[PDB]
Design a protein around this nucleic acid. Structure first.
Ligand SMILES: [Mg+2]
Ligand SMILES: [Mg+2]
Ligand SMILES: [Mg+2]
Ligand SMILES: [Mg+2]
Ligand SMILES: [Mg+2]
Ligand SMILES: [Mg+2]
Ligand SMILES: [Mg+2]
Ligand SMILES: [Mg+2]
Ligand SMILES: [Mg+2]
Ligand SMILES: [Mg+2]
Ligand SMILES: [Mg+2]
Ligand SMILES: [Mg+2]
Lengths: 51, 121, 200, 118, 52, 50
RNA sequence: CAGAAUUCCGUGAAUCAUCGAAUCUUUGAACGCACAUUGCGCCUUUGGGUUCUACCAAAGGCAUGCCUGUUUGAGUGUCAUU
RNA sequence: UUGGAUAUGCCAUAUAAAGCGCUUUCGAAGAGUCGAGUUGUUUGGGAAUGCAGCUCUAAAUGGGUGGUAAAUUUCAUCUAA
RNA sequence: UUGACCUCAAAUCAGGUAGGACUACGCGCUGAACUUAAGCAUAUCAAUAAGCGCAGGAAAAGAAAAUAACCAUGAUUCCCUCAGUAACGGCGAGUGAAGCGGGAAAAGCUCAAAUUUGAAAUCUGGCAACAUUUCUUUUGUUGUCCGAGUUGUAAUUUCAA
């Protein structure tokens, strides 16, 4: 029960939250994919500007 | 072992006759197998069976090619002679059907096509 | 042309002319099957503006749907739960009766694609609808760039997924603050997914 | 337009027969179970031998789908003999056995030797 | 005309515009004139001098 | 019961066939552990259950 | 374990690899009707046995809803001409 | 494998269709739908956020939105079925 | 009497088409209770589990009947932020979005409402010829005839006009 110092707790974890946890282990993979897509697009539309 | 390129050179009737001979022979090898036989005849059962298959394949190849010939340039063809890709691919819009455009769309592409351009720094 | 006159006259559902025609047609409709083929649109102007065209491959079907709410189909009014869930009688289906009309006609014509539907009549027991359908296998449809899109397999049974005009309405699909609950499940997922980044 | 019955019945209409624009199957299949499939092998157990030399009857292992009609034709076509009666049984191993009695003008022992399972 | 609303306004429209109009039998008979199965309505705009 | 269907009889034939010893040369193969089997059914012990 | 040396300087071994032609039993959405039945039918053609009608065999066929089109029709639904 | 190059070498597409430009009079725009009430449900949405049933049921500078119910007057912004 | 039209049938009619499976992800319907509130009914668990329908390589959404209240912005989606905030709540336990801003990616359009009326200019099917092919397996072109279609198929337009 509540007896310690600090803010009254507020944690919104009463649903099955572990079912919908989103991790970011693919963050460097996504970054590489997106850069490769830009390189592929740039070579395809050249010499038009990419933007 | 019969040579299949030699088989294709023969008429269908002669092939049908040769097939009956092979089946009669295979029946003899099986009878002898029941009443005792050496290992050469046992290996001859398997060889004779594969020879029957070779002949059947040639007969069917010839029959199917004749059917393809009979249905050349026909709108409707036997089902086993049509494409055997997937069911979804067969139902998909043809490239021709996909490339159909309205007159309004055809005019737009003719008068305002995307240009090749570059920005000089 | 005539279409503007038909559009304006269709707005006068209380006039003597439309009241009489409604009475005779509703009687005629009740005499045939719950689902039956229409030889032509009873409302040609309404059919055109909903995508119908008078060419081979476009089909009109008529259907009557029972009016009123959805009685909870539980054995003797027994719900086995908390009082908030004990209701049986004054409950409502989340999909429109027009959506049900499309669903049933689409099952009845499983080779066709449901395009749209419109109201035609009602009495105390039934609402009457006409459902516009398209044959994706017909050459007149497949070579037509204005309706070609519906051949592609992503449009299979669009009425069952709430993708017709009335289906998107019943799903609450719209722009802006009044539709924040949006596609409900997708919106709900976005708000209930805990995002744990590689903090490095 | 005189109707002497209080019952309307559907009038008779033409009902054309099929005239396909294409054969659905390109090549007709060869006869399944002609005569080399019907007769699988002679049976030469001791009991079968007694049937050969006492009752003038041959014992064959035959296809499960052969019947007494097709077994008779197969034996006539393969071994040029005329069965007078054919009895059939399905063995506990699931295979079919046929007792083929030959006429009094043929000798089953000679036929067995000619086939070669003796 | 089976969905009658297609032509139910036509006599009022013709009367308002002062164009003579008649209701005649058989959309099917009208269609035969113009080489079609049926025609909801026909109009005469110009007639040769010999038919005035 | 001796009153039996064809389908039942076919299953009994198959059950009897799978109820046989493995030939030894099968277990003599290089890389085979078929030496003993737990599929030896006996009529009084383990029932077919149709 | 063999067997196969009618092959091993070869269109040829191999439970080899690969794969664009075929075969692909009884079923199963499962489609002549069934099915605790290898139960009971119908159609077309071709053969067998004296059999244009019975019987036997083989090949090919016979489910349902719906769509476009065809043919044959139905209606004291609406009409024109005799 | 005209995707790019002199894409050469050549096919012969290419004779009639688009761009801006002054002046006019114009400018068809989705109905048992919108909207209102009410009941149920739902939402963070609060004298109703969305959905649905039933009742009533539109308009032509109309109509929707502008997160406190209502009447009126402005303004802004959008243009549903 | 026939024929036309309409409406409605039948056929093993000519050609097609649907069903079943896979369900991680996707679009809907239907729909609990355990649980938390130190009891418990609203609430919560949860617009969740189970049940039912329906898809694709992604789906859905999407070119404003959108924001704002600015010097204004400019389809949709996703991320960060807004924000555990405004708000909801036996205002208890608990619950809880949006506009702006930064970023990923960017793309825009089609109909219905119009008299072509000096010409249904439109389309499907059959037949024939001629091409074509991931392919004798694919995909079309022309001619001709028949159907569809004026209760309206094309063409210019879609409000940004
Ligand atoms: Mg969409
Ligand atoms: Mg018996
Ligand atoms: Mg609009
Ligand atoms: Mg509910
Ligand atoms: Mg408690
Ligand atoms: Mg407790
Ligand atoms: Mg308790
Ligand atoms: Mg579930
Ligand atoms: Mg797939
Ligand atoms: Mg999509
Ligand atoms: Mg717009
Ligand atoms: Mg909640």
């Amino acid at each position: 029960a509540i007896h310690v110092k600090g803010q009254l707790p507020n944690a919104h974890f009463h649903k099955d939250w572990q079912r919908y946890v989103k991790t970011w282990f693919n963050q460097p993979g996504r970054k590489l994919r997106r850069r490769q897509a830009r390189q592929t697009k740039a070579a395809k539309i050249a010499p038009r500007p990419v933007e | 072992a019969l040579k299949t390129f030699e088989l294709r050179k023969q008429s269908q009737e002669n092939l049908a006759e040769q097939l009956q001979e092979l089946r009669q022979e295979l029946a003899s090898l099986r009878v002898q197998k029941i009443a005792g036989g050496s290992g050469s005849k046992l290996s001859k059962i398997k060889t004779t069976r594969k020879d029957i298959a070779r002949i059947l394949t040639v007969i069917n190849e010839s029959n199917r090619l004749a059917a393809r010939e009979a249905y050349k340039n026909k709108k409707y063809i036997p089902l086993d002679l049509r494409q055997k890709k997937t069911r979804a691919i067969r139902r998909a819009l043809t490239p021709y059907e996909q490339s159909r455009k309205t007159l309004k769309q055809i005019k737009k592409e003719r008068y305002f096509p995307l240009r090749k351009y570059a920005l000089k720094a | 042309g005539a279409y503007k006159y038909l559009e304006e006259l269709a707005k006068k559902k209380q006039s003597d002319v439309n009241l009489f025609l409604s009475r005779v047609r509703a009687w005629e409709y009740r005499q045939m099957n719950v689902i039956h083929r229409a030889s032509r649109p009873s409302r040609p102007d309404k059919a055109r503006r909903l995508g119908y065209k008078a060419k081979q491959g476009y089909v009109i079907y008529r259907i009557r749907v029972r009016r009123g709410g959805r009685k909870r189909p539980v054995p003797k009014g027994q719900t086995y739960g908390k009082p908030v869930h004990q209701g049986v009688n004054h409950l409502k289906y989340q999909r429109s009766a027009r959506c049900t009309a499309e669903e049933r006609v689409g099952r009845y014509c499983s080779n066709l694609r449901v395009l749209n539907s419109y109201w035609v009549n009602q009495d105390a027991t039934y609402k009457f609808f006409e459902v516009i359908l398209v044959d994706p296998s017909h050459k007149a449809i497949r070579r037509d760039p204005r309706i070609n899109w519906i051949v592609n397999p992503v449009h299979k049974h669009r009425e069952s997924r709430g993708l017709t005009s009335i289906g998107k309405k019943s799903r609450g699909i719209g722009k802006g603050h009044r539709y924040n609950n949006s596609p409900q499940h997708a919106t709900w997922l976005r708000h209930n997914t805990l995002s744990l980044r590689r903090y490095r | 337009k005189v109707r002497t019955s209080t019952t309307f019945r559907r009038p008779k209409t033409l009902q054309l027969s099929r005239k396909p624009k294409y054969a659905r199957k390109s090549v007709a299949h060869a006869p399944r179970l002609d005569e080399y499939k019907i007769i699988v092998n002679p049976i030469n157990s001791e009991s079968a031998m007694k049937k050969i030399e006492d009752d003038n009857t041959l014992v064959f292992h035959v296809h499960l789908k052969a019947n007494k009609f097709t077994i008779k034709e197969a034996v006539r076509k393969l071994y040029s003999v005329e069965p007078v009666k054919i009895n059939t049984l399905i063995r506990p191993n699931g295979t079919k056995k046929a007792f083929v009695k030959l006429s009094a003008d043929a000798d089953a022992l000679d036929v067995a030797n000619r086939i070669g399972f003796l | 005309v089976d969905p009658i609303e297609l032509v139910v306004f036509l006599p009022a429209l013709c009367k308002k515009m002062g164009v003579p109009y008649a209701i005649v039998k058989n959309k099917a008979r009208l269609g035969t004139v113009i080489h079609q199965k049926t025609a909801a309505v026909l109009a005469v705009t110009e007639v040769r001098e010999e038919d005035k | 019961p001796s009153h039996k269907s064809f389908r039942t009889k076919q299953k009994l034939a198959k059950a009897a066939r799978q109820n046989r010893p493995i030939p030894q040369w099968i277990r003599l193969r290089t890389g085979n552990t078929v030496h003993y089997n737990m599929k030896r059914r006996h009529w009084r012990r383990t029932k077919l259950n149709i």
